[PDB]
């Protein structure tokens, strides 16, 4: 059984980064002790605590339960005695997060490459939403890049799974959270739904076309535009009240009309007028066609 990964031949070659609750690592599983095994990438707690724990088991089972080719694969799990301390095993994407990529190649990714990315997110995001997933963190660096023609979901570290009667969950007491990716809803009641998760693939999409300029990033864009004076509690009171009047990230420089109404449309304070991720797939599959 392969998803089985023993510990001790999991070979430490990079610190990949952190995410929420976790490091990730890259590692060669190398049983052979010959340097000739798989290079997979291997999610694990930073704090394992009781609480951590249980939601890092959830996020390993929602994982295993996803298969597209745009969310990134689950191979296995490892497991350490007594205290049972769990490390997920994924596929390794040596092209990195679509954030990094994005900053490094800049406008060398030209629009038709931008809408594969994401026609390609949208058709991850879909899939999720018909196991009733909610992502709550999508972002440029949650996403990974397996090559120049793909994109996959790279992370699931703040999702949840609706309960069966309501199409949102509320939560109840909230971590960090990446507030300028949130939807109305969701900074006022913590309510998250896929509609909320719409709002935030518009400002991933945002994120692409202004190609990950660090002087107009979400949080630079919104902090100018509530006052970078406001701290703490006070930026979220002040972004609620600055979206319920509207305000919005501007059009990124060069960005095509077509795909500025898309960003515009997500971010709708009536959840119910925001596109399905099913009709923006076709939409920006419609684009790509036209180009
Ligand atoms: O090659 C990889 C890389 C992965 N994760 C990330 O790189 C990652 C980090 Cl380190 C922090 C936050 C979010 C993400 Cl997606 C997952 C699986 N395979």
New binding site residues.
């Given amino acids: 059984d392969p998803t089985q990964f023993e510990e001790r031949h999991l070979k430490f070659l990079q610190q990949?980064?952190?995410?929420n609750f976790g490091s990730?690592e890259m590692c060669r599983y190398d049983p052979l002790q010959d340097n000739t095994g798989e290079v997979v990438?291997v999610?694990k707690l930073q704090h394992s605590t009781e609480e951590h724990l249980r939601d890092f088991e959830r996020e390993i089972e929602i994982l295993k339960s996803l298969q597209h080719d745009n969310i990134?694969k689950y191979k296995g799990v490892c497991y350490s005695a007594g205290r049972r301390n769990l490390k997920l095993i994924?596929?390794?994407?040596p092209y990195?997060?679509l954030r990094d990529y994005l900053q490094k190649h800049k406008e060398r990714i030209d629009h038709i490459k931008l809408l594969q990315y994401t026609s390609q997110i949208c058709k991850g995001m879909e899939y999720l939403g018909t196991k009733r997933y909610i992502h709550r963190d999508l972002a440029t660096?949650?996403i990974?890049v397996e090559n120049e023609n793909r994109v996959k979901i790279?992370?699931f570290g703040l999702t949840k799974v609706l309960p069966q009667d309501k199409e949102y969950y509320k939560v109840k007491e909230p971590g960090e959270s990446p507030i300028f990716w949130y939807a109305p809803e969701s900074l006022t009641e913590s309510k998250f739904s896929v509609a909320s998760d719409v709002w935030s693939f518009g400002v991933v999409l945002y994120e692409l076309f202004t190609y990950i300029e660090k002087s107009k990033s979400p949080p630079a864009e919104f902090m100018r535009m509530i006052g970078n004076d406001k701290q703490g509690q006070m930026i979220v009171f002040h972004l609620i009240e600055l979206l319920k009047n509207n305000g919005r990230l501007p059009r990124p420089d060069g960005c095509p009309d077509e795909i500025y109404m898309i960003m515009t449309e997500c971010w709708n304070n009536n959840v119910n007028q925001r596109p399905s991720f099913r009709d923006l797939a076709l939409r920006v599959d419609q684009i790509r066609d036209n180009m």
């Fill in positions: 990949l980064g952190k995410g990730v990438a999610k990134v994924m596929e390794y994407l990195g997060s660096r949650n990974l790279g992370d």
